[PDB]
Symmetry: C2
Subunit: 351 residues, 2 copies
């Protein structure tokens, strides 16, 4: 069993999600994975068809599946809509409906793509860092909150269970990688930082196979530029994670290379970081790497098929060098690039 | 009049502060600045001499002067002391005594030093950014604050006068540079961010000669790595400023190049970012660039002698290429490097 709800969304979403499906079907056929999937309406296309971005049929399909493969969502066309039915509200409704409390965003400098990084080649080399960001609490949602003409106030607050559950997702993710977690806080100045640190240390005792270190968020802004290749997994609160994930996201030097996973109680959601790029919808040029790597994330984080996720990543790594898409200075269309990924998957299998 | 209280502090502090004084005496002699200075005990040396880091005589001298030239402070020797008399408490007492509410930290990639940056040469080229960080408020000092076994909480809060006064320091600093301020907030999610943005926009109307743009803190973590050369002045709240100033601080690739200024109601304090480096105290090798640039900051931000500050910066820029200190891969001692700075100041004057 591998039951996937596919929500291809808007703009280039249908193209790049289909590229990811071609990869998953090739794996299913080669490995006997028991893949079953169904496509559901979501985002702008759903608004246009049904009058809302996350209609009942889709909520049901997402609930019933074991993972969501989501394309890009939204665009200029729907920007003038009431908030209640906007594509972005659909995305919040999707994530809330599943209580997804951890966002995982990996930033990887593939070998031979150091040239793309803003960092010098020797610093970019070997970067492969996974930022795990607490998604449902902290100052973004804390109470009290408000403003008057005199002042305004927001509250960074965390309860023990919120810190525990994001930490566990980080330790589990590190087991699948290089078994190293850095937890990030502001424990030398803030009570929430002290509390976060002690809670993560306590949770860490359940994961004796994973090394744990603590760093302050300001020091981490230094380290992600000076020696990012030193990290494996990094876990932190919502606002710090938003900042550091954005910092890590620019190290590979290309938006089309970045996948995202959101994990929690319900069905986990895997999607590209890039948007719907409507100006190139239907052209067959979008770089499907983010989507394909989101399917590798699905294999790894929803299904525990870590060896398979690594095979997909290696095939993508080779394809980026062999037949780079236009965003990397090459000329490979979406389908040609997907075919190159499949050739490498096939070649690695035939050992 | 230019009355300066010199607090040379600990470790390499006396050496590098004297290098800065040689520069200021050369300028005073060439320009007729009316420099008057006195040396006062501060930090570990004061603890050893008087039993406390910020004794009465020094508080008086700081109050009576127009600026403080402060060396590095602290070290291993005093780490086991009660908080009440630690060197770090001395520094907090110094800054509080003067109600210094804005910290200004410039990060500059001097021409021909792009090689030092972690960023590719073409991105490092031309970086000259000044981060202005609100120093006395925001979540670091906000109430309510606390922790229990169940949860912990800290409050990011700002009143209108706190935002106004740090913004004015940023607009004033931009006038002396390239007349461009980017204010940074989290206005798309947080009430404090909305409040900060509207307040800064209102203050900006008093500075029609300075351009103003707003950016979110997460976007700024992207921009300071992908296109830092695009910024001139950046102003933000305490925790965001701590994070972004640390991020900017690594772009030049050398700690010895970074000065700091703290400005507010009382006497403004100019100091290196580097610490006391006690292992090389008395060797005559410390790079005095941070201290000398802190004296340029003093000229600019305390005395408005912007042309003179730029002359000191240009002479330092040439000296770093001609006679680089050991931290830049060269072999110039502290005095030889200071002499090179003086040769360039002399040569630029004799037009």
């Amino acid at each position: 069993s591998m039951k996937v709800a596919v929500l291809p969304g808007d703009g280039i979403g249908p193209e790049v999600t289909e590229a990811a499906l071609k990869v998953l079907r090739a794996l299913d056929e080669a490995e006997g994975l028991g893949l079953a999937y169904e496509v559901f309406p979501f985002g702008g296309a759903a608004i246009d068809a049904f009058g809302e971005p996350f209609p009942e049929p889709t909520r049901k399909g997402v609930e019933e599946a074991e993972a969501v493969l989501l394309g890009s969502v939204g665009g200029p066309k729907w920007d003038g809509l009431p908030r209640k039915i906007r594509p972005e509200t659909g995305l919040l409704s999707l994530r809330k409906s599943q209580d997804l409390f951890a966002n995982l965003r990996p930033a990887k400098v593939f070998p031979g793509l150091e040239r793309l990084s803003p960092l010098k080649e020797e610093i970019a080399r070997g970067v492969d860092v996974l930022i795990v960001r607490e998604l449902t609490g902290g100052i973004y949602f804390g109470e009290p909150r408000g403003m008057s003409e005199a002042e305004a106030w927001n509250t960074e607050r965390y309860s023990k269970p919120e810190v525990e559950r994001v930490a566990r997702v980080a330790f589990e993710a590190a087991r699948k990688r290089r078994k190293h977690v850095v937890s990030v806080d502001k424990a030398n100045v803030l009570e929430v930082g002290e509390f976060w640190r002690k809670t993560v240390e306590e949770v860490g005792r359940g994961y004796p196979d994973v090394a744990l270190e603590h760093q302050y968020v300001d020091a981490m802004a230094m380290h992600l530029v000076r020696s990012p290749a030193r990290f494996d997994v990094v876990v932190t609160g919502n606002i710090f994670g938003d900042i550091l994930s954005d910092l890590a996201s620019v190290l590979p030097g290309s938006l089309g290379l970045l996948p995202s996973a959101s994990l929690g109680r319900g069905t986990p959601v895997f999607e590209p970081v890039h948007g719907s790029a409507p100006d190139i919808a239907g052209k067959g040029i979008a770089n499907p790497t983010a989507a394909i790597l989101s399917a590798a994330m699905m294999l790894e984080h929803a299904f525990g098929l870590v060896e398979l996720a690594r095979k997909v990543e290696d095939a993508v790594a080779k394809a980026l060098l062999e037949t780079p898409p236009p965003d990397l200075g090459g000329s490979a269309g979406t389908e040609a690039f997907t075919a190159t990924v499949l050739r490498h998957l096939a070649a690695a299998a035939l050992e």
